[PDB]
């Protein structure tokens, strides 16, 4: 737990963790290590994390107590056929099919991996079998909202009367498909979770690319060009007639206009006029591969960029022009298009794809559910003020994708939720014809605090009343401080908390005594006046408080500019429910923020941006 977990993860990613070649280990299980253990102990692996029981099946439609789970016996392949195979090479077709349970969109998404070896390896390790180092364990690699995750599973498949209840080969001999589906269900919590799935998500999760989909009854223009250019990039195209067989587009020529269709279930193809294609099928799905996906010499690939961000209630969750008061607060990104797309017919511009996929949330029980209504706007050209070329398109899909061709230049991307105030995370990707440049557009870290110069001045009364208050040591304590200020501010918010006062002292001490002198009390009083002003000028409606969203404003007035993450940190930690930040917390944060900078500066003499601490020193500064 703790942001230190996230901070370690980020570090790992920055060095490859999450890339296809160094996939994140799901639930920390390591395939080899687990395999080898089952060998030494001469046993057949059994997954602790995803056991062969009802919970791995469902919780409602397929939950225990339900008469659909009654009769299921988990069995391994070796016990369902006399020489089960992982995969049979030399295939010219596939015979995958479902069981009584198990969704159909899976046939489509899985069948598509049979057309290209290289695309199948990526998601299905080839050095596996029921013969060699077998021990009842198989791993697979899935793409998850940006990064790759390796998953493990024991080969126990659910059956009911000697018949797989899900995805399996017709000849009942191969098993990689049945396993790949088992794994996919694991990383999704359960088989029932797959019920509300969609081929576009499967396509993505199985390959790591971006998927454009088109309802043929409203095709975009130059579709044929899109198809032809996709095929050239080795993209995966699939079409169908929906209201049940999934075909794929494997050729497109002008000689008239023709597109070749292939049935992964036949070994055969056939051509047809582009005209008939547009009238027979009702859906075209294009899975655009990332540039690393294929190695076949020149297949021409896209240029990819990807960033991450989030929306947090109270600081960064505004989104959608319709809410001008908060819209400019969402995270913001910048795209730089240079070289345009080459000639052919239509005018000019730079083609690129943009997708915003919302990451997984705790309450997502099944695929496709409790999804936020997302979308993003684009603008032609620090963190941009409320003074902010397409936008629109706001549906509740785990991903929103828009295709564009624009004149070379710089544009500003503003991902967001439809309504403001909603927590969620996300990843944005840009696929483009030519090299494009991404860049976050945000405030860099900055602290410019006003250094008051107490000195002589300081009144007669002030000095006198102090002495008659400081006692024998001419200094006061954080406790005495509380009471002194309570009386003063009593005459907005009604009193500073004792933690606020203690940090004040830790800041202004410097005399290393746990107490503040006369000059030190003077400076505090001065800073306390500033805070009171700023807070006042923000509370334009004299309500006695401030709202979480005004904090960015206020911080800037106090000499601070921070990135979106730190603004989230601040509102999460100091604002109460109903996003209100009272005056005590208001200054608590400012004092704390200042002391934290001063400390960093002290521990970083060379001014390098990074400090090296040991365990004992670390505890001292982390909590004192």
């Amino acid at each position: 737990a703790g942001i230190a977990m996230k901070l370690a993860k980020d570090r790992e990613a920055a060095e490859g963790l999450g890339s296809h070649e160094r996939a994140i280990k799901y639930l920390n299980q390591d395939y080899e290590t687990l395999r080898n253990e089952c060998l030494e102990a001469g046993a057949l692996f059994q997954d602790p994390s995803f056991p062969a029981l009802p919970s791995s099946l469902g919780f409602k439609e397929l939950g225990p107590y339900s008469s659909k789970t009654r009769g299921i016996e988990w069995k391994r392949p070796t016990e369902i056929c006399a020489d089960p195979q992982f995969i049979i090479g030399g295939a010219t077709r596939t015979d995958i099919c479902q069981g009584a349970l198990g969704d159909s969109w899976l046939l489509a998404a899985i069948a598509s991996l049979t057309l290209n070896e290289e695309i199948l390896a990526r998601v299905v390790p080839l050095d596996q079998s029921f013969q060699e180092n077998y021990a009842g364990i198989f791993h697979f690699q899935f793409w998850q909202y940006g990064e790759w995750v390796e998953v493990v599973v024991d080969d126990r498949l659910p059956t009911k009367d000697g018949e797989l209840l899900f995805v399996h080969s017709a000849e009942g001999s191969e098993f990689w498909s049945a396993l790949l589906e088992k794994a996919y269900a694991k990383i999704n919590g359960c088989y029932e979770a797959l019920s509300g799935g969609a081929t576009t998500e499967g396509f993505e999760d199985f390959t790591g690319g971006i998927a454009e989909w088109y309802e043929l009854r409203k095709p975009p223009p130059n579709l044929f060009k899109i198809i032809q250019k996709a095929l050239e990039k080795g993209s995966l195209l699939g079409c169908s007639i929906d209201i049940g067989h999934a075909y794929s587009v494997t050729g497109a020529e002008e000689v008239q206009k023709l597109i070749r269709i292939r049935n992964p279930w036949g070994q055969g193809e056939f051509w047809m006029s582009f005209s008939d294609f547009l009238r027979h099928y009702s859906r075209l799905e294009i899975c655009n591969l990332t540039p690393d996906t294929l190695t076949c010499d020149s297949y021409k690939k896209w240029k990819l960029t990807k960033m991450d961000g989030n929306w947090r209630r109270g600081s960064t969750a505004g989104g959608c022009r319709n809410y001008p008061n908060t819209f400019w607060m969402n995270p913001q990104y910048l795209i730089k298009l240079e070289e345009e797309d080459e000639d052919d017919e239509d005018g000019r511009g730079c083609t690129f794809l943009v997708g915003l996929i919302q990451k997984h949330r705790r309450r997502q029980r099944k695929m496709g559910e409790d999804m936020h209504t997302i979308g993003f706007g684009i603008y032609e050209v620090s963190k941009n003020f409320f003074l902010t070329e397409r936008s629109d398109t706001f549906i509740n899909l785990r991903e929103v994708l828009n295709r564009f061709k624009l004149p070379p230049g710089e544009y500003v991307l503003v991902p967001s939720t439809f309504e403001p105030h909603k927590n969620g995370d996300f990843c944005i990707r840009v696929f483009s014809e030519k090299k494009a440049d991404y860049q976050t557009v945000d405030d860099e870290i900055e602290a410019n605090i006003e250094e008051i110069a107490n000195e002589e001045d300081i009144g007669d009364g002030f000095r006198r009343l102090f002495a008659q208050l400081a006692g024998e040591d001419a200094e006061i304590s954080a406790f005495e401080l509380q009471t002194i200020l309570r009386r003063v501010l009593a005459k907005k918010s009604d009193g500073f908390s004792i933690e606020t006062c203690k940090i004040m002292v830790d800041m202004l001490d410097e005399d290393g005594s746990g107490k503040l002198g006369l000059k030190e009390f003077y400076i505090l009083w001065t800073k306390i006046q500033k805070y009171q002003k700023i807070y006042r000028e923000i509370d334009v409606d004299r309500s006695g408080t401030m709202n979480s969203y005004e904090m960015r404003k206020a911080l800037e007035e106090a000499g601070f500019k921070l990135p979106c993450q730190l603004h989230q940190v601040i509102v999460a930690r100091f604002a109460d429910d109903e996003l209100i930040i009272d005056f005590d917390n208001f200054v608590r944060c400012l004092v704390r923020l200042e002391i934290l900078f001063k400390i960093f500066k002290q521990l970083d003499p060379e001014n390098t941006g990074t400090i090296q601490l040991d365990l004992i020193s670390w505890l001292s500064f982390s909590v004192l």
């Binding site: 746990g514 993450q565 940190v569 400090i611 670390w618 004192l624």
Partner: protein, 176 residues
């Protein structure tokens, strides 16, 4: 799996956030103060909102100000252990623990520092007499634990040291 004190707790969660299974800092407060403060063998008004917010903060790596249930179980556990310890030292059941015994208290807690850190910790978390109450004792342990862990987290290989940039630092110390 889990236990009887937890499921009873899981209960309060479900009712509060269904499948979200997260808690606010003020929700956390109400829960724990229905449990720790209500017993004759422990003098305490319970934990305060600031104490709770810090608990959520050090335990929440998503920046949502919400405490997750798995995280809450971990926390509770620590709170029960440190609860036992506080009783072992609040001799007269005065409500606090004397300034001289505390060092041994934090050591009974597994946190071995030096007389200077306590002469920093005590001075930082005690009342004006120099003594700490249940609220603050726990509050201070939550953070000591939080920062011990963060250090381990950023020191993968076990080098007795960690390096951090201004950004990592402000997050580590601001959210706590």
């Amino acid at each position: 799996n889990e236990s009887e004190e937890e499921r009873q707790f899981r209960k309060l969660f479900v009712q509060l956030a269904g499948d979200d299974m997260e808690v606010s800092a003020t929700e956390l407060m109400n829960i724990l103060n229905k449990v720790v403060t209500r017993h004759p063998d422990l003098k305490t008004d319970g934990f305060g909102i600031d104490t709770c917010r810090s608990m959520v903060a050090v335990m929440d790596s998503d920046t949502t100000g919400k405490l997750g249930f798995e995280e809450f179980k971990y926390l509770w556990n620590n709170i029960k252990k440190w609860q036992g310890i506080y009783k072992r030292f609040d001799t007269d059941r005065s409500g606090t623990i004397g300034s001289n015994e505390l060092p041994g208290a934090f050591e009974a807690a597994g946190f071995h520092l030096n007389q200077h850190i306590y002469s920093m910790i005590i001075r930082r978390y005690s009342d004006e007499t120099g003594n700490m109450d249940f609220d603050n004792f726990i509050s201070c342990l939550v953070r000591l634990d939080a920062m011990f862990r963060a250090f381990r987290s950023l020191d993968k290989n076990g080098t007795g040291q960690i390096q951090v940039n201004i950004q990592e630092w402000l997050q580590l110390t601001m959210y706590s």
